[PDB]
Amino acid sequence: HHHHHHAMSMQDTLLTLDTPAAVIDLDRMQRNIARMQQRMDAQGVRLRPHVKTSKSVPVAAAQRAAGASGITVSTLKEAEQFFAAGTTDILYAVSMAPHRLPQALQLRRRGCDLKLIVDSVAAAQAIAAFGREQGEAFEVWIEIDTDGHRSGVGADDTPLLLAIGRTLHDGGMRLGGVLTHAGSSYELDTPEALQALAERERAGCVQAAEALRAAGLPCPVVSVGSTPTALAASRLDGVTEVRAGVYVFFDLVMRNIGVCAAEDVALSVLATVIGHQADKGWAIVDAGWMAMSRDRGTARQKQDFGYGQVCDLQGRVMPGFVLTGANQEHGILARADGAAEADIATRFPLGTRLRILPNAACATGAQFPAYQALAADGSVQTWERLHGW
Template identity: 70%
Template sequence: MTLDQIETPAALIDRPRMMRNIERMQTHMDGLGVAFRPHVKTSKCVQVARAQRDAGARGITVSTLKEAEQFFTAGFSDILYAVGMVASKLPRALALKRAGCDLKLIADNLESANAIAEFGRLHGETFEVWIEIDTDGHRSGVKPGEARLIDIGRALNQGGARLGGVLTHAGSSYELNTPDALAALAEQERAGCVHAAERLRHAGLPCDVVSVGSTPTALAARHLEGVTEVRAGVYVFFDLVMRNVGVCDTADLALSVLTTVIGHQADKGWAILDAGWMAMSRDRGTAKQTHDYGYGQPCTLDGAPLEGYALAGANQEHGILASTGQPDTDIAARLPVGTRLLILPNHACATGAQYPVYHARSGEGRIEVWERFYGW
């Protein structure tokens, strides 16, 4: 298969770039002396997860129980379901456990902790549960110093459940863009999660695992004393948001969308593509960053960016490629109908989610089709 034989739009993985990204993260984690548990929600692809495991990753993180089921079927057994558990989902978690999956759940409130423990006791099972810690006010979790942390820990230590550890995600790192700021947040993330673990242990509760992570803080961390594992996901592909954060270069982005020029509005300086927001997603994560890429950065087929151009607009199936400066009234001659381009995405997770398969391209130009999981 060649690029010319792929119907557009299509999601392409640059395998050499992906492998360099995997090696970079794993080497950094090995140097810091911690286990690495990749978040496979970015790719939702067995071949990608296997490459991460082969490089040294231990276990995986998932964002849906369907991912857990599909990756378990594919041979992954050490799985963290990193979204707060609710009672209605416990039967699926039970089925995974009884099938042999080493599934870990998370909770950040007493109601969920009690529901997990009660369900476990009712079915003669013990669920391993980690408490989610809020170290940056970004989203979910218990603050490290809150009194209810101990109450949740005790609820998970009375049969039906077992307190396995604590975890946190410094998602506010996506809002930063300097090495010093990222390093400071990485330390805040580490210190907060370790403090929560120490409080639980001081209360006589077990807390074996201290799990931290986001792609920016994982790469910015200078030491991880007290941490047992790190989680990160988007690093495997990177994207334009991460490029603005400063943890990668454009040449590191391993996911792109293959698209075709289907027309022009020459007076406006537009080239019309067959990749709209259904192909790229509606994620405009770079809009508030230092460089706004619109809906994506156009590139030639060899991955070289078309400097001064962006996917400036998008309808459902139409993308508008335009100059970021003065309108390019010669764009029809520069990019004639039928021209194929690559578009680098703002958010690799969101763009990947638009496709049932990836087309993975090797350095020699060989292309393989890799299936992608989807749904909940």
């Protein structure tokens, strides 16, 4: 009975945690993980979750347990951490910098099946020359620009695709596939527009693969995805896998895009009321921008939630109250409509605990060394996440 009694006495709840804290509602997180995996299963495509949203081993474990194939990472620090934790199938989906090639080699030499990406002849030449010198056939995929968002070779630029694909293949590297990310989906907010963009993302990445194969080059993987297009695509013909990451928790930007509801948002920041300015209808809380992040993605969408939507301790939205302003360690809670709440101190007494839903789950999560994973019984567990590079 010794381990039992001591663990009981040490176990935290939302009442005993210090604030601010990043809380994962595990039941909502599981519903999000199931929804995404079922959709991809229905599409006959693999899901390669992007772990940059959580950078947390237990979160990724839940995604793998539900049926995910491999992971996408946004840094080699993430590749190192998840490989040490037993994940071998890892796509580093940021244009490869030559100077990181020794670290990518060492990961592959230790047993990580690490894939790199490029979008230029010079980056393909760098990888191929280093692979030849070191006796390593790196696997490299070619990044495609399908919507004008950010990096990538134009889907209709056959001459640059062929030049890159030949540099890799002739150079003795394994040209493993093409990938694209239609991040312009963040600017949309109707199901029509999202469905059309998901079709353009699919069409364009398949087009780039078909041009490489028509030149005799291998291109066995075709990888697409953002959360909104993964949820909106009607068809995924020619795609082998979809990458999505922010869905694991969702957030108010996703809610405004329309691919979830506020009640699907699994990450919230637990905060305490530390003061008021009664005549302005303000409550002051200890979640400022250092807890929420400076992300204000909702400011240009159909509903601006300031630095976040206020929920009660049970996680239920309290409509009309948001964090209207934030300094480093102080957040300013007030009415979204700009009215001065009368009696704000009785509506939100000193020491009251609240939960704030984030604009951007990827940005808020990065502010914390760890999440507190909240089980149905009200107990929490600390789930570390990675910071830095």
